[PDB]
DNA sequence: TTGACTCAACATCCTTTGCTACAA
DNA sequence: TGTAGGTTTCCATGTTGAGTCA
């Protein structure tokens, strides 16, 4: 009957046996991970056993002003989340997801930690809290380590400082929540005890397959606006179009001679990878065997020849002949083809290899209009708040992952223009385009 | 210094770690790895030319060699003086779509400042860095330093480093005292059990590096029996053992003569000695042994019939101080502890421990000595 | 406050186009 | 998929936050 709920460095502990716990002698009480509070409390409040909770240690929530003129689908998302205050909202990149999260925390009026992947999103969330909420949130992670009121943090800093901050912030926000079900970030989410949890994303579907853990970690998808469908009060009409390039007859010789090594290696030793999800058995053999890694790196170089083929450059020139008054962002698979394009067509590159100031400066001049055409190596998938364009070219498929198409083909957030996207692929090879 | 975890090459035999070092049969490889790095050569030419060796020899070892030797070289930015502004003034001329127009643009640029900027476009990045001088080094020193770095990478994941003494006793405990290390002195075989980096929440880097300094000191000795209890695993962590002794195949290079000169200890010494003459001080009293468990305080302070053993602490956790007080609860001396602000600040058992920030406040020490007059 | 440099975590890495057509 | 098994992932390349020195 009488039972006491307590917290300790990422764990919840009590006396009565609740579903999801386990006996522990070091703690002399039934212990489990903290994220079960929002459930186990509801298991005792329904059993009418008058349990006292001593886990919520929220810091004093400062009074905040609401200045968000939210739209209608945003209000529907707010309602669908407010039902049980535990879920995920799927809205394409640039649909005002940050404003939705801010309105929700404004209604909640309870202390909150917003966990974001990059320093760029830290700055964006800080500026939008200063604008739409008129408050300076605690900036932990990166330069500063300030922890006040409503706070924002990186996933990395939230994991390294997890038990230090688990008993705080009754509400959690996960912008781009598809980064949470990783190895360490899953542990990070499990150590926290926030009963109220909201995840934000544009593309929730992971080719990884670990995207099942959402209801365990933050809750189910409570409202997802149909992706790439509502185009009236969103970005213009999507106009995906593919271009198939005849691969070079000179390159084709080496390509076939290079995939023959892998084909004959897999046929001669069995262990067929055709329609085999486990590509890991072959690398486990590759770490110790010589020809295993030889044929595997040969396969990798053959795929490289396929995606970064020079014949595609010809059609690039063609497209740049056609479009001369639209903002063009050309994507590629690797730094190699990015810099090849930069040297051939005189276009600034943006990779991880380019420094921070140079990256931000090319972004500044791209917004200004001084640079019309830019080339980048997949680095602009994130929510960096990169200025949109109209024409968006893709030269590196980077696999059929939803991120490098949805989260990449969602950096076009303008209106009253054509705004088409082109996928330049060679027909000879993999061209494993998203389904 | 150590190497990255994806180059740590080791095996497990019945819950016992065995690091795969480099024998003499591999010197040949090492030779080429030094003969590939010529003066005025770029890193791209290097890695591209060693893809053939990775198909023949162990790729992890080849990466280790090239990584270390690049850590030793002296690099040049590039020969053109404007490494970045080239693209500043050159990309402003729109996307070029004809070869004649591109050559016109490159000639206009080669007129605007004057240079061979057709090859010097993208400098200031890894692959295009050149070599000013080839660093002088032999193959045997290289394999010795690889082996030492591999061992340090292994020990970087350890939970406790037990070191067995051979002849020298006081030298290594003084080193541990002025390296901030967390130690327990036991006398069943007369060993020191140092807490490993895995006992820190987020402080592990400085402590592991200082522990590595003490390690490279231990390697120059008569014998060095060490039994490091390691914690390995990226998904789940299992505990293993790593025994090693008398492995005289390591580097006898610079010892970093002055890493920590114990300014806090001498400051406390000259502060205690010249502020009151009622309490005594001892430089380093003989360690108090209690049931094979050795307690090594830093100073003894006795004024008649009241003797206290004061000990200053560097790196520290809550568990460490709790365990040290629990052990010293049977030392028959009031134990005084001086904590540095290097973890979550605590005040439990205030009658045994005091904290400071940069130096020791002799006023607090005297107030505490007057609390037990 | 910088700017180096690293380094751990996290990501992708997979089967082949052909007789039903729309353009959303 | 489950009435058994012992164990560090990691052939590549890409990104970035974090944390160390001088
Ligand atoms: Cl109103
Ligand atoms: Cl303000
Ligand atoms: Cl969806
Ligand atoms: Cl639907
Ligand atoms: Cl490994
Ligand atoms: Cl052995
Ligand atoms: Cl071997
Ligand atoms: Cl000419
Ligand atoms: Cl006196
Ligand atoms: Mg107004
Ligand atoms: Mg308006
Ligand atoms: Mg679509
Ligand atoms: Mg052709
Ligand atoms: Mg397979
Ligand atoms: Mg700057
Ligand atoms: Mg031998
Ligand atoms: Mg010889
Ligand atoms: Mg001419
Ligand atoms: Mg010799
Ligand atoms: Mg005591
Ligand atoms: Mg300090
Ligand atoms: Mg990290
Ligand atoms: Mg992985
Ligand atoms: Mg700091």
Residue numbers in the entry:
A (entry chain A): 0 to 434
B (entry chain B): 0 to 372
Task: Reproduce, without paraphrasing, sentences from the article in which this PDB structure was first reported.
XPB is a superfamily 2 (SF2) DNA helicase conserved from archaea to human. Here, we report crystal structures of XPB from Sulfurisphaera tokodaii (St) bound to the nuclease Bax1 and their complex with a bubble DNA having one arm unwound in the crystal.
Extensive trials on crystallizing the full-length StXPB–Bax1 complex with DNA did not achieve diffracting quality crystals, so we engineered a truncated StBax1 by removing its C-terminal domain, which is absent in many archaeal Bax1 orthologues. The crystal structure of the StXPB–Bax1ΔC–DNA ternary complex was determined at 3.55 Å resolution. Surprisingly, the 6-bp short arm of the bubble-6 DNA was unwound in the crystal, which is consistent with our previous observation that binding of XPB to DNA induces changes in DNA electrochemical properties even in the absence of ATP. The DNA-bound StXPB-Bax1ΔC heterodimer spirally encircles the DNA substrate by the HD1/HD2/ThM of XPB and the NTD/CRD of Bax1, forming a tunnel for 10-bp DNA duplex binding with XPB closer to the fork. Furthermore, the ThM motif of XPB intrudes between the two ssDNA tails like a wedge with the 3′-overhang extending through the channel formed by the HD2/ThM of XPB and the 5′-overhang extending into the space between two N-terminal β-hairpins of Bax1ΔC. When XPB translocates along the dsDNA ahead of the fork, the ThM motif grips the 3′ overhang tail and the tip of the ThM motif, particularly residue F278, functions as a wedge to break the base pairs along the way.
